[PDB]
């Protein structure tokens, strides 16, 4: 029954990590900061079905901003407005989390906050020199909910 | 501990009904089928944050269609397109549900499908004539998610 799947999903929030349920970067729907909000761009955005779109610059691992489809409400597609312009105005916060972060805590961070999206990253000491932050993908609240209510 | 919050929330699925967690009609965000997708109407839709919007005709309790913001992707707001044009074309299915439906059952119906929205209605034995289905409001997947994960 569902009750069992949920409880089991709850217990596993202790062991499991954001890396276990995240959406790997290569599968993430992203957009470039050098984008122009013409009718076409905005069409491709509203068509994706996504509410939150990560904004990258140069590489996909260089997530620099967060686009909400809600931010395109007053954008006129005939102004051919740059995305930089909007992201500068709204400037929604970016939240980063580590790959080893447990799901029970991530959920807790998600609940206190309007943030339901976080960038999963890890530490790459595998240099070649200075260790740095490597982006792995993004995790959203729906990702942990699913690991709770799914059957297993 | 969220673990216990989730577990207890899961225990309450067998007792509580869709009527207990639904969004009552008076608080639902809707739109008339007589609408026109001019720039203003689009903005209002795109600003609510709602990804799914019920369509009513004449009376709010008379829900006849379902609008997805995905359906607005290729609409040019300068064309001033009837909402009927889009609802007729896409023709997204409507799902109804009874108020006495337990949540564990409602959760089950949401998983086995794409529909995460359902119109709650009850049986009106209070005629004045033949009985009928009376619309109470809408319930979505997130409504039962909240019930499970909310703090108590």
UniProtKB/Swiss-Prot annotation, chains A, B:
Highest taxon listed in the record's lineage: Eukaryota
Q: Where is the CBS domain?
A: 22-83, 90-152
Q: Where in the cell is it found?
A: Cell membrane
Q: In which tissues is it expressed?
A: Widely expressed. Expressed at higher level in brain, kidney and placenta, while it is weakly expressed in skeletal muscle. In the kidney, it is expressed in the distal convoluted tubule and the thick ascending limb of Henle loop.
Q: Which family does it belong to?
A: Belongs to the ACDP family.
State any further remark. Shares weak sequence similarity with the cyclin family, hence its name. However, it has no cyclin-like function in vivo.
Clinical condition linked: Hypomagnesemia 6: A renal disease characterized by severely lowered serum magnesium levels in the absence of other electrolyte disturbances. Affected individuals show an inappropriately normal urinary magnesium excretion, demonstrating a defect in tubular reabsorption. Age of clinical onset is highly variable and some affected individuals are asymptomatic.
Say what the protein does: Divalent metal cation transporter. Mediates transport of divalent metal cations in an order of Mg(2+) > Co(2+) > Mn(2+) > Sr(2+) > Ba(2+) > Cu(2+) > Fe(2+).
Q: What is this protein called?
A: Metal transporter CNNM2
